[PDB]
Design an enzyme around this catalytic site. Sequence first.
Site, PDB file in Angstrom:
ATOM      1  N   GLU A  35    -102.318  10.304  41.292  1.00  0.00           N
ATOM      2  CA  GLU A  35    -102.644  11.677  40.897  1.00  0.00           C
ATOM      3  C   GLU A  35    -104.029  12.120  41.365  1.00  0.00           C
ATOM      4  O   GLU A  35    -104.188  13.241  41.867  1.00  0.00           O
ATOM      5  CB  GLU A  35    -102.542  11.849  39.381  1.00  0.00           C
ATOM      6  CG  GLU A  35    -101.128  11.724  38.822  1.00  0.00           C
ATOM      7  CD  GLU A  35    -100.185  12.829  39.269  1.00  0.00           C
ATOM      8  OE1 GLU A  35    -100.628  13.776  39.952  1.00  0.00           O
ATOM      9  OE2 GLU A  35     -98.976  12.732  38.941  1.00  0.00           O
ATOM     10  N   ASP A  48     -97.133  27.968  41.855  1.00  0.00           N
ATOM     11  CA  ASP A  48     -96.884  28.938  40.783  1.00  0.00           C
ATOM     12  C   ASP A  48     -98.162  29.567  40.211  1.00  0.00           C
ATOM     13  O   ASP A  48     -98.101  30.482  39.385  1.00  0.00           O
ATOM     14  CB  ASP A  48     -95.994  28.337  39.681  1.00  0.00           C
ATOM     15  CG  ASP A  48     -96.708  27.286  38.823  1.00  0.00           C
ATOM     16  OD1 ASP A  48     -97.860  26.896  39.128  1.00  0.00           O
ATOM     17  OD2 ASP A  48     -96.105  26.845  37.823  1.00  0.00           O
ATOM     18  N   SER A  50    -100.541  27.790  38.554  1.00  0.00           N
ATOM     19  CA  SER A  50    -101.134  26.850  37.595  1.00  0.00           C
ATOM     20  C   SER A  50    -102.022  25.865  38.364  1.00  0.00           C
ATOM     21  O   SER A  50    -101.978  25.804  39.595  1.00  0.00           O
ATOM     22  CB  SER A  50    -100.058  26.098  36.799  1.00  0.00           C
ATOM     23  OG  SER A  50     -99.286  25.279  37.662  1.00  0.00           O
ATOM     24  N   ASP A  52    -103.702  21.709  38.226  1.00  0.00           N
ATOM     25  CA  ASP A  52    -103.708  20.363  37.642  1.00  0.00           C
ATOM     26  C   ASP A  52    -105.143  19.846  37.596  1.00  0.00           C
ATOM     27  O   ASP A  52    -105.906  20.024  38.556  1.00  0.00           O
ATOM     28  CB  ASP A  52    -102.911  19.394  38.511  1.00  0.00           C
ATOM     29  CG  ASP A  52    -101.454  19.755  38.621  1.00  0.00           C
ATOM     30  OD1 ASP A  52    -100.923  20.438  37.730  1.00  0.00           O
ATOM     31  OD2 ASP A  52    -100.830  19.300  39.601  1.00  0.00           O
ATOM     32  N   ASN A  59    -101.440  19.713  33.848  1.00  0.00           N
ATOM     33  CA  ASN A  59    -101.172  21.061  34.336  1.00  0.00           C
ATOM     34  C   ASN A  59    -101.444  22.150  33.300  1.00  0.00           C
ATOM     35  O   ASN A  59    -101.086  22.013  32.134  1.00  0.00           O
ATOM     36  CB  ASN A  59     -99.718  21.128  34.831  1.00  0.00           C
ATOM     37  CG  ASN A  59     -99.403  22.403  35.561  1.00  0.00           C
ATOM     38  OD1 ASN A  59     -99.763  22.588  36.727  1.00  0.00           O
ATOM     39  ND2 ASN A  59     -98.711  23.294  34.885  1.00  0.00           N
TER      40      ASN A  59
END
Length: 129
Positions: A35, A48, A50, A52, A59
């Site tokens: 990640e 979209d 958003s 992270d 998120n």
Amino acid sequence: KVFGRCELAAAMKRHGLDNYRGYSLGNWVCAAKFESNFNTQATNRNTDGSTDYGILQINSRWWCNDGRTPGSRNLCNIPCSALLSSDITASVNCAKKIVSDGNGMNAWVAWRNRCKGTDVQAWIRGCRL
Ligand SMILES: [Cl-]
Ligand SMILES: [Cl-]
Ligand SMILES: [Cl-]
Ligand SMILES: [Cl-]
Ligand SMILES: [Cl-]
Ligand SMILES: [Cl-]
Ligand SMILES: [Cl-]
Ligand code: NA
């Protein structure tokens, strides 16, 4: 902060992630590796709109407030910025809620694609824990 591999394993263990919801420490370290490369300050914008945040790339659509994700929730009750701290407490507490949401660690697509089913114990091998 960029954690070392064993350093992060120890911090995750201290904060109660080892075997949380049945997921061994190596699963968590593996997820963080892919990640964020162990960088607490990692961010990534999603298609979209958003974003992270942090070592586990949590998120803003559901879990934290960043003020710029329309129609989103803040289920961990934190500013997304808290997820970028050198102190992993906020990330760990929020990850505990996420992994309890029903789909376990599959919530982290990179865990499913890169960690799930692999020899995750290798991620904590050698570490004084
Ligand atoms: Cl590594
Ligand atoms: Cl493990
Ligand atoms: Cl928002
Ligand atoms: Cl909310
Ligand atoms: Cl906030
Ligand atoms: Cl910490
Ligand atoms: Cl599960
Ligand atoms: Na949000």
